[PDB]
Amino acid sequence: NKLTPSGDLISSMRIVQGGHGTTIGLERQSNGEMKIWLHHDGVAKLLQV
Amino acid sequence: KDLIKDIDRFVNGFELNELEPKFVMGFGGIRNAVNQSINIDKETNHMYSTQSDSQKPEGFWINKLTPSGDLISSMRIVQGGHGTTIGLERQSNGEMKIWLHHDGVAKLLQVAYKDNYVLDLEEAKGLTDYTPQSLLNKHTFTPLIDEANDKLILRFGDGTIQVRSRADVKNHIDNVEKEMTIDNRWMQGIAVDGDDLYWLSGNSSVNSHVQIGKYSLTTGQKIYDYPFKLSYQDGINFPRDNFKEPEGICIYTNPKTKRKSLLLAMTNGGGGKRFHNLYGFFQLGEYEHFEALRARGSQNYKLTKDDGRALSIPDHIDDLNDLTQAGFYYIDGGTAEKLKNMPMNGSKRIIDAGCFINVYPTTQTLGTVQELTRFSTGRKMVKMVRGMTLDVFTLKWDYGLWTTIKTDAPYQEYLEASQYNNWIAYVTTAGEYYITGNQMELFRDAPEEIKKVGAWLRVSSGNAVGEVRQTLEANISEYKEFFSNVNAETKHREYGWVAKH
Amino acid sequence: KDLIKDIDRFVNGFELNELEPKFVMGFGGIRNAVNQSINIDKETNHMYSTQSDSQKPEGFWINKLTPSGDLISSMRIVQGGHGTTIGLERQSNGEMKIWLHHDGVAKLLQVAYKDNYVLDLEEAKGLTDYTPQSLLNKHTFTPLIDEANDKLILRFGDGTIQVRSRADVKNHIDNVEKEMTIDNRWMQGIAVDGDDLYWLSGNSSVNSHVQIGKYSLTTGQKIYDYPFKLSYQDGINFPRDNFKEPEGICIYTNPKTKRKSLLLAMTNGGGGKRFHNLYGFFQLGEYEHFEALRARGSQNYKLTKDDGRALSIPDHIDDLNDLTQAGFYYIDGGTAEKLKNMPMNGSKRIIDAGCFINVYPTTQTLGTVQELTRFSTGRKMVKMVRGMTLDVFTLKWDYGLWTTIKTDAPYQEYLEASQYNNWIAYVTTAGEYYITGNQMELFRDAPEEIKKVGAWLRVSSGNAVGEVRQTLEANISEYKEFFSNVNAETKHREYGWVAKH
Amino acid sequence: DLIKDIDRFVNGFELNELEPKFVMGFGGIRNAVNQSINIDKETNHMYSTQSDSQKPEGFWINKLTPSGDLISSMRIVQGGHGTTIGLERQSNGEMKIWLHHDGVAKLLQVAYKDNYVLDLEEAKGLTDYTPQSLLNKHTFTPLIDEANDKLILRFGDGTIQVRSRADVKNHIDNVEKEMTIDNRWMQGIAVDGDDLYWLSGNSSVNSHVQIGKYSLTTGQKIYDYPFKLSYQDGINFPRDNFKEPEGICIYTNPKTKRKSLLLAMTNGGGGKRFHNLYGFFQLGEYEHFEALRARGSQNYKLTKDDGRALSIPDHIDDLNDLTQAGFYYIDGGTAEKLKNMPMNGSKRIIDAGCFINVYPTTQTLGTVQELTRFSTGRKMVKMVRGMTLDVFTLKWDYGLWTTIKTDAPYQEYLEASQYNNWIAYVTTAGEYYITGNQMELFRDAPEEIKKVGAWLRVSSGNAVGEVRQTLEANISEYKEFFSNVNAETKHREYGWVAKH
Amino acid sequence: VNSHVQIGKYSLTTGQKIYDYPFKLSYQDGINFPRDNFKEPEGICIYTNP
């Protein structure tokens, strides 16, 4: 879930069969796009989506 | 002593004002507009250019090009500004990132290049800002890269040049390593190679000379100005439509030979007809690097003579069946009269004048098509095609039947009875012809009802048994039309003319 | 001391792993299959390649090629084996002999090359055997030649290299002068230059690097392995269809300059689409030898812009009569509206949109054809051609009448009465048009019987007196058709519409 | 010694040590052999001469682009053979030509004019620059040594007169140097300072091309240099076995000051002559002319390098995606599977291999796809459609198919099953044939001719997207029917209407 | 959105600029994400707590 600084929902992204999503890592790119470090349990890979 | 200092200069020197500018290749771009910048990706030989998008708040396109200048894809930076310069940084996974200043969001960006992609304003706002801390609220610059030293250089409108470390900017480190000032005629391009800075200037007029100024980043002062003339379409300072605008420069260092070239982009052609040509200044032997890249993308099989004349058939060709080599040919009337296996309508050679012969670029098994175009100025032009295939086991050819492409002109396709042995049945090639009253009297198989008057002859396509239907429409003020079937090969008439009226 | 040892290395060095690979030219072959070997005939500049024939007991083709890679002729060795390598030996009378191992008859042969010839098995049995005495019942080798030293080298499957004198083998003398052993990745080519042996390896995958190993025939051991990347269609390691297979190497020694090149054959393109590209490693200045050979066979007159865009007409051309220079052009709708001498149907400009203009490669006396193609997406495309000739004494042009190539689409060629001054008689260009009921009412010369209903208009070719017959077929459920002759130039109607029903 | 070897290779310009290399082809207004060749160093223009083939011989002067294309020509009516000429570009950019006008027996300095005929009456009023000592002795032609501003006169008997060009322009008669040159006759001459070059050889394949090098100070021959050139099919394999030498010139690069000796050859048979430029170059100087050739060459690939048509990329499975210009061919298998091929209902019209000509594009990348069905036993079908690219959305818009009318003496056979037994499916304009057997199988066949064959003719569309089908019975009596069909939905508007 | 907000600090005794201070504000959706992409500065004032 992407949220405003006041907690309102902007948008959401579903990782189908990605696992529990216990923790993730944020890495904002230079062009302003956000990449998410997450472990996709379905494909058994550490991803930067 | 001196002979060596002369040879070393000629062999190993790279002093700009001692080098000759040479045309390299043309290159494309998605926009029908002038070019703006040019850069080489040394790890792929790809080229990248920028062009304006010509919109209310200016944006620019980034064009990804083949090493021979063909367009691979383009990326639009909506409201990104002029795109005067950009910086290439290829990542480890093979993806390309572009250093550019997005004027719309007032941020220095490092954007991932995407093929045929539109970077709209809402996405650009969410991208990471790499603008140095000391340069906020001061967004009048564009970036470029010095590949050899991994420097990210910033060019400012007022003429300030800031040399920074690319890695520093990527790590949000604000450190100006070198700063100098550059100073009718304005900037058209800038390239930095180590200590050497190059400054391109000149406008599009034929009377405005192209010039590159060489500066030293350590001294900060100009070394020299280098004016030069380029050879365009019709020679030195004779560009198409009298338009020759300089559109950016870049330094290239050969990864293998480590020798250098300075490449220069020019736009020629008139309004709405712009096209881009790459020139270069080269160390000895380095022009061949780019010539090979051009050659790979060039037409290396001769379709016409080098001056635009069509090919002539070899003297040893006396048979159309033997002209199986691809190319655009022309034969004059004399040759058309004598060549074996030309299209016939019985005893009449259909191509009774000079003839263009287009032999198609062949199939993978050397099959081809011969497309004939009868060259006349007082009669209609006849177009006919036939195919042929080569048996790779017997090395013998199989030739197909002739197809006629329907053509018509406001003048008649006149039928002289004597040329067809006075047989209308000889005319089995599809199309429309005209028989005058005088000639109808001379044709043996003319319909008696219209024996003394003219008529259009129309010949259909074949049926299942190889017959074609001939139709005669009398050229009179009353409706009279006849038809009759004829066997295309033997010219045997199946039945007498059948009246429709 | 050192500056000279650097210049001499750069100018006179021929160390393979210090040289840059450069594209030279493409080349053909009779088979739609990958290439296998490549060789140069130094006395003619002819090239020779081999290809598999893809048959049950494998045979191979020998292709004789022009210096620019075009196919001259081919010779098939039925059941001759793979044809991995061959050796060229040009005879005194100018005939070429090919050293090859015929696997079908298990003999080393010296066959006379013949153009487009099939060497069947029965003939191969009667040919002279040159297999050395010690190599009978041991036929797992193919031959190659070292031209500079007149050596015939035999490469064995197990990796044995036998260096023999070619003259010795021709004289049935069995003497092994040198023998060494070469040793996932297998052999793709081998070339010998004096003491230096080169070993090409690598598979077709984009992930498999091309590599040449350099060996010394005196030491017998490897000097070094040299991996390298080539620039393909879209750049370094971006070949068409992701296919890049190495297909043989050869050393070339320039007869005049005595300087050397190592040429490398690659096959690119996907299944059933293979094509062959020659690369090379060159001493300084030797690339120009092959560039000139490529240029002689290349298209040296510009038919399109360098990026595949059609040519634009010069700004100074405001009259189609002046566009007599060969090339493929495009003009936009605005230009088509203003150009003088465009095709007309009375007051109506036929080409009422953008237009491709194909100016044919000219006759030997600079005659040419202009082929116009109206560029639209919502209407049919009109194609028209006219010819023109140049008087070499007056330098004036004569322009012929327009021929229409018949075209049709499932959409109408709509006639707006006002554009023809409300005269159907204005439409004298051959073809089929449609008149809606609304427009028929507005045409002054419409047939009264169908004044308020639509109809197809068909216009024939001219007759002897410059008249054309117009036909109107009513677009109704009952048969109603009319005809009337019109003079194509003056638009004068000869008589009222004549009913066929 | 290693330096004396490197300097020779890098800075040497000894003719008989240099390799001849093809440079470029070049044109000319006349369908005839070439005669001379010269470079205008200030523009890179080339100038050649050709005979006019007239009763008193005249010659043409051709002005050429740096890539050999014809800009314009000027005819010197009855001017003679035009064996050699001299270029002198003026300050205002106009070109003047030093030539000997044999018709008026005068050495002239004529202003070059584009596509202009210099008739005899005008030539008589032109200024005479013939030296005082050379009147009534008009058996020479002029050439220029650009580097030293010399005007050289070559005489028929073999006399070479070296004069100052400025002197001749000022009507000053002074012979600075004179030497004598001496089966095989003169084909060209070029002077570079002290070096004089003499080209000889005839058109036969058995006649070797040769350049003799002479010294103007010594007056004697230094050496003869025979050489072989590589022609269309290789060394001494010229087209039609014709290879005639047609002039030479020395070129000095204004920037590098290094030299080239250029040689013009004419190849091809009678009435098919074409001209090819060769050269001998100092190290690095070939690139000067290669760049000039490249500027005028076709630098976008239309066919494979051996004359085969392009193949479509493996990743193209949809004709809509083949928007890149070029001449392509696809085999029958590929034509069967490609998406968005022309259809007549359920029937794929292109039911064989197919040439695909993708036009060189508009300035906004619009193009046309022209398909040609490749068969040998059936007629060849030709169809075209256009498409445009939206530069804002980067999406393509594809137009409807136009059919180019084609016909052969064999039928375009209609198998009822391939059209789901509907004649209405055939809405593409053209003429087809339905056999009696197939007419019985078509559901919408006219009953009156249910068991007999007929030609099917399909018209162009009308305003409402309908096309008129016409059936003409293949019998000895007049029977013809028509009926309208909607091209898209294949819906028949009404039953067949008899004309008989 | 591409125009940074800035406050310049000056000294009335010296008469010259001390420094320029550019800064980013957090709007509806965060830093430099204002509603309808409009963010215009409209005055300042100093407040001293009595």
Side-chain angles (χ1 to χ4, degrees), chain A residues 22-39:
Chain A
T22 318
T23 58
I24 57 172
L26 308 180
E27 187 201 319
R28 184 175 179 86
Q29 305 296 296
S30 49
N31 61 8
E33 79 189 317
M34 176 60 71
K35 290 215 179 170
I36 312 288
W37 290 96
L38 57 88
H39 188 273

Side-chain angles (χ1 to χ4, degrees), chain D residues 92-201:
Chain D
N92 61 8
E94 79 189 317
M95 176 60 71
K96 290 215 179 170
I97 312 288
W98 290 96
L99 57 88
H100 188 273
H101 194 319
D102 290 358
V104 300
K106 296 189 297 190
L107 171 67
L108 303 183
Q109 187 201 43
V110 314
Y112 181 89
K113 292 161 187 277
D114 299 298
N115 290 336
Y116 184 83
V117 178
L118 183 74
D119 60 61
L120 210 64
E121 271 296 323
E122 182 180 359
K124 291 199 284 81
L126 295 185
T127 300
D128 197 342
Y129 290 97
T130 317
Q132 186 173 355
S133 65
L134 289 182
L135 290 98
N136 64 34
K137 197 214 174 180
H138 289 105
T139 53
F140 67 89
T141 55
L143 61 86
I144 287 199
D145 175 8
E146 174 274 320
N148 302 88
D149 196 47
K150 302 294 179 185
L151 184 56
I152 297 96
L153 309 180
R154 183 278 307 148
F155 291 88
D157 56 60
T159 305
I160 310 302
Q161 273 189 0
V162 182
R163 304 167 170 269
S164 161
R165 183 211 54 78
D167 273 357
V168 181
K169 178 64 181 172
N170 297 324
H171 305 289
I172 297 184
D173 190 337
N174 178 44
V175 180
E176 303 179 350
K177 288 191 274 190
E178 187 162 318
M179 65 173 285
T180 303
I181 187 74
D182 211 14
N183 185 22
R184 297 182 57 96
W185 59 93
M186 188 260 248
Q187 300 283 29
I189 170 169
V191 176
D192 175 45
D194 191 46
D195 302 318
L196 184 145
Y197 299 100
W198 185 264
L199 176 76
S200 63

Side-chain angles (χ1 to χ4, degrees), chain C residues 4 18 35 52 98 105 116 133 144 150 162 207 224 241 284 311 342 357 387 418 427 429 448-449 481 494:
Chain C
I4 295 313
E18 299 173 11
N35 194 65
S52 175
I98 312 288
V105 300
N116 290 336
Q133 186 173 355
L144 62 86
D150 196 47
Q162 273 189 0
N207 294 327
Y224 55 69
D241 303 324
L284 180 72
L311 302 176
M342 292 289 287
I357 304 173
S418 67
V427 188
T429 300
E448 159 198 312
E449 190 175 348
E481 189 162 308
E494 296 317 302

Side-chain angles (χ1 to χ4, degrees), chain C residues 49-120:
Chain C
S49 67
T50 56
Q51 296 177 289
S52 175
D53 67 5
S54 312
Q55 298 307 118
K56 207 96 64 205
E58 197 175 3
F60 63 95
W61 287 90
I62 302 172
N63 297 296
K64 182 183 186 184
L65 311 169
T66 71
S68 62
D70 298 348
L71 185 60
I72 297 178
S73 64
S74 308
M75 185 182 179
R76 189 192 172 202
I77 314 299
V78 176
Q79 306 188 36
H82 190 79
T84 318
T85 58
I86 57 172
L88 308 180
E89 188 201 319
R90 184 175 179 85
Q91 305 296 296
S92 49
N93 61 8
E95 79 189 317
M96 176 61 71
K97 290 215 179 170
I98 312 288
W99 290 97
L100 57 88
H101 188 273
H102 194 319
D103 290 359
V105 300
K107 296 188 297 190
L108 171 67
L109 303 183
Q110 187 201 43
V111 314
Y113 181 89
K114 292 160 187 277
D115 299 298
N116 290 336
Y117 184 83
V118 178
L119 183 74
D120 59 61

Side-chain angles (χ1 to χ4, degrees), chain C residues 26-52:
Chain C
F27 63 94
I30 190 173
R31 284 298 329 285
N32 183 23
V34 307
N35 194 65
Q36 294 295 348
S37 71
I38 186 67
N39 285 112
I40 310 285
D41 174 13
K42 67 164 207 207
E43 285 177 32
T44 64
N45 293 332
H46 290 153
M47 295 178 99
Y48 288 80
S49 67
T50 56
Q51 296 177 289
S52 175

